[PDB]
Symmetry: C3
Subunit: 336 residues, 3 copies
């Protein structure tokens, strides 16, 4: 163990993959490399470390989703605490497995640096999300180098949920956040220009309104939105009123840039692991789907896991939950 003999890193072997189209940004759409408009449709699964701990990190999970749930995309929420606990080298080795599985099934990955808080002050909602600017840069530097020229890995979601929690974490400042995303994007593009960065707004990735006046000044990006049921709070709960509020905060973005709702979903207020902002009577499902389909918005439901809520499944035999059965039918129909 001489530190001077520690190897320089290696890149994923693209020859190990079957042919797969690259996804790219064109105006306000994604397109495949055949030129056809593309929509990300799929789910989040849990952090790789959580799945490994219960022996659920396996190809059979991806096969279930691709073959039975109609997904074309899986979002991997890589939690900083798990990145550190497994260690970068081991974690990347498991992401490699996901790449191979996904490629074999013809589906795509969104790699999400899964933190919640305010990166400019390095203050977070919970220790599982704890990180630094330095560690965040390093994650993207390592990821972009390793998966250079890998079509399967389509989207780099830079920071899951920006929030200052009522300014208890710092003073939210769009200019500062914009500049930091631009810095990350520049590192990424210096290493791989074929990948799609995904940028989020404040109020837990809900409010993209700042981009009306001050969008990120880089091409080829998309914007994230997390339009959970309780984020908009109209006094009268109907399509028209939710649509208008969604329009104002995030939906407008889809007129100019591609948008991925990288989290959405619900559970009954008296259901399993129910909490604000995910409580709903179920009318939200058809509403958000109708709204997204109208605008051509892409999405990954939270979450295809039986422990973390709101769940899509009740157990590891994949018994569907209320929202699981709903979205499964939606995705299957969209696939046709």
């Amino acid at each position: 163990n001489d530190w001077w003999d520690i190897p320089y890193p290696s890149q994923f072997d693209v020859k190990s993959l079957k042919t797969q189209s690259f996804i790219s940004v064109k105006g306000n759409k994604f397109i495949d490399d055949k030129g056809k408009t593309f929509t990300f449709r799929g789910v989040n699964i849990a952090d790789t470390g959580k799945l490994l701990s219960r022996n659920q990190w396996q190809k059979s999970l991806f096969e279930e989703l691709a073959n039975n749930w109609g997904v074309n995309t899986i979002r991997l929420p890589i939690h900083p605490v798990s990145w550190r606990k497994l260690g970068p080298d081991v974690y990347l080795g498991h992401i490699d497995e996901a790449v191979r599985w996904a490629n074999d099934l013809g589906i795509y990955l969104i790699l999400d640096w899964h933190s919640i808080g305010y990166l400019p002050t390095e203050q977070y909602q919970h220790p599982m999300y704890d990180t630094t600017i330095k560690e965040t840069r390093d994650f993207w530097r390592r990821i972009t180098f390793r998966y250079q020229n890998v079509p399967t890995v389509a989207v780099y979601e830079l920071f899951n949920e920006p929030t200052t929690m009522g300014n208890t974490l710092g003073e939210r400042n769009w200019a500062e956040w914009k500049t930091l995303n631009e810095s990350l994007i520049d590192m990424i593009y210096a290493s791989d220009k074929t990948v799609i960065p995904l940028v989020a707004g404040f109020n837990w990735a809900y409010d993209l309104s700042p981009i009306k006046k001050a969008p990120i000044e880089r091409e080829g990006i998309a914007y994230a939105a997390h339009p959970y049921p309780q984020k908009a709070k109209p006094e009268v709960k109907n399509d028209k009123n939710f649509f208008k509020l969604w329009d104002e905060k995030w939906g407008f973005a889809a007129d100019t840039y591609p948008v991925i709702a990288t989290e959405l979903g619900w559970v009954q207020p008296d259901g399993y692991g129910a909490h604000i902002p995910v409580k709903d009577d179920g009318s939200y499902g058809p509403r958000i789907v109708k709204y997204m389909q109208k605008k051509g918005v892409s999405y990954t439901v939270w979450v295809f896991d039986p422990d973390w809520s709101p769940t899509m499944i009740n157990d590891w035999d994949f018994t569907p939950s209320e929202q699981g059965a709903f979205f499964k039918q939606v995705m299957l129909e969209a696939k046709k």
Copy 2:
């Protein structure tokens, strides 16, 4: 030990306390919530970890001080190395004990993030004081959330002693330091507006002169001063000359803002643990007391401990030292 099951933090239970007035800032004074002018008068004790290590962290210490030494305030100098060694969760559990003890005795706490150095460059006088901007923010975020609405915890002293040690630690810059304090204050006020932040100047919390032109731009704060005997160095040592020098550097602040001299004290030049700037023949005692009483300045003597110098006590039976006997009489008389 699954990291996703680590609990979110809880707040101190205010129902566990007896009725106690809140202290607040009004102009250049502190007032209690009955509207009466209030003066912090008390002592520092040692870091909680030091006391626990010798089994001296107990209610009987607070009882000695309240009943026999006339104090209405105790300053807790929380050293970053001890915060890390005990760990936040355990350290906060011991601060809870202090809150309950102090509340029962009708006295107040000043919570002091006890570092010495230059936080903007993260360089310090000694490793026991080592911290980062990130860790400092986190400390105040955790403290402010936990003690929301707790009258007993009156003052949040953001950073004990700013100094660049002759610019060996960085280039002292008031604008940069001011901005950082303002950032901390904003985090604190976003979580609890009833607490009093206490801000310090350069030259080891001695020089408040920068606030003449550029005071912190936030309401409800106070300023710290550490007017140890050797900080002012008049050629002729008398009341008039020390008073003028104190006026110029820190005393003037009390005309506009409340001031707490959160450290002061002396030992004979040939006494126990004697060092610059605490050496004095004893004439300093009546002088600083006269000066503070004239201006209505609050204070906490350093230190009610038999090991750390200058001591107020010779042993844990509370045998008074020279300065201990002096200040004990002063505080007892002021209490009457």
Copy 3:
């Protein structure tokens, strides 16, 4: 093990040294304190931790170099990973040994904080070089205090090789880098004004061109250059064309400031540990020596070690390599 009893640091004992001239900057030259023009001529050796691990950290190494290789200078490349692995206290104790050895032999040390990457974003070429702004400041704070007034330690080389690796590590920005060096210099000069800071440019300490318009705004400094054989790439390889390219990027600096080429050297393209940018047929040796001698440039060859390449020696009996035999003759002749 009470953290409050951890000692404050001590300074190297200058009384332990024999008389040795201080080296200082005067215009574009170094001069000794007798007023005579001085040129650093010597070698790098490996990191102290690497040498200790094979029992090669000993005075006999310095004696070999001074007595048999004509050196007046040794550059110590202190790798951050090794600084952390040995720990500051132990590492400084070994640097003390080097100081005593070097002083006894009448030779000088360049202390090099041996990182490769972009310090403003804290991203690096390899983990052995990993550091932070905080740790880098702390290193120089500790070094400058300890070796105050020690003539033997002549040059503080602040950061070995700045590079953004094609902007994959961050966006190279001269203004930001300049400001950071100025910050380090100010810390150093606040502690010891007799030492020479050595500042490097981008493209792995190759490109000093930014200083034409925006030199570091501090007196008494020198500039580093690492003119390895493949850094300049003329289509026709001859003296004239290399000289012009070297002139443009780094050589011009020697007209106004002292310059130390703190790394240079070569190995045959099919030789031991051959890599870009050190591959050459050997014509580089006479060329760079001629160029440096013309301009009065100082230098330390990389590297007097049998493992790290390009080597000056084949084994620890000091069998010379191709470049070793070449530079040994050059230095011996220059000494005469």
